Structure 1
């Protein structure tokens, strides 16, 4: 994928946004921005430029599933890739986010190997 691709890492825990930032830095993606919740995330997606989003599920103000359906329902961001990186593991929630239009799903704790594995599986089906 184009190394200038703009990413939006959304999660309520600092520890976890920084751990994903670095992981992306190792992969060559240095144009990354942070968000602490669904709302703040949409606020930045409003500014424009983003082409890839990695989000968590459990977050205040507007959870991940709400942010997923919001992007999938907005006419100007509907196809924006969205990779889920959360702690939820109930087949019922995996499905739920799956049907909501999730690009990919990564359960925490995850390996650096697993993130790259699902970041590419997403670039593969979207011919990015």
Structure 2
């Protein structure tokens, strides 16, 4: 299963890709809004793991991009972000995120939530 990992802090992104590799996934990297848009293409990701605060546009705006395009609107998105306030968790979910995980995170819970979401398609 391919996972688009969207995260601008390169050492965190690489750590996340390692956890995912070790858990059976094939991650692909995007470091900002525009890279995520461009990287979002064939071969399609099975899921998009998405930071909120990114150069060039937020992950909220990215979900709006995904959901506006009939070709991408069914691709699951799980947010993984330092924005932990209730208002933000609700905002992410309501925009279209299938789940929303806050930093710092447990690598076991991260993988468990991704696989839970993947079970639901």
- Taking structure 1 as the reference length, the TM-score comes to 0.88
Provide the aligned C-alpha RMSD in A. 1.2
Q: Describe the SS at the equivalent of 1:46.
A: coil
Matched with 1:113 is 108
- The aligned counterpart of 2:5 is 9
Matches within 5 A, 1:1-128: 5-29=1-25, 31-126=26-121
Q: Which runs of 5+ in 2 are unaligned?
A: none
Instruction: Summarize deviations over 1:67-106 as a string: whole Å, max 9, x none.
Output: 1111011111000010110010111111111110101111
Q: TM-score, normalised by structure 2?
A: 0.93
Deviation at 1:48, TM superposition (A): 4.2
Superposed CA deviations along residues 5-51 of structure 1, whole A, max 9, x for unmatched, are 2111000101111111111111111x221011121101111354222
Structure 1 runs (4+) deviating above 4 angstroms are none
After TM superposition, give the deviation of residue 114 of structure 1 in Å: 1.2
Between the aligned partners of 1:121 and 1:92, the Cα distance in structure 2 is 24
- Partners of 2:72 and 2:38 in 1: how far apart? 13
| Structure 1 residues without counterparts, runs of 5 or longer | none
SS in 2 for 1:102: coil
Moved more, 100-109 or 113-122: 113-122
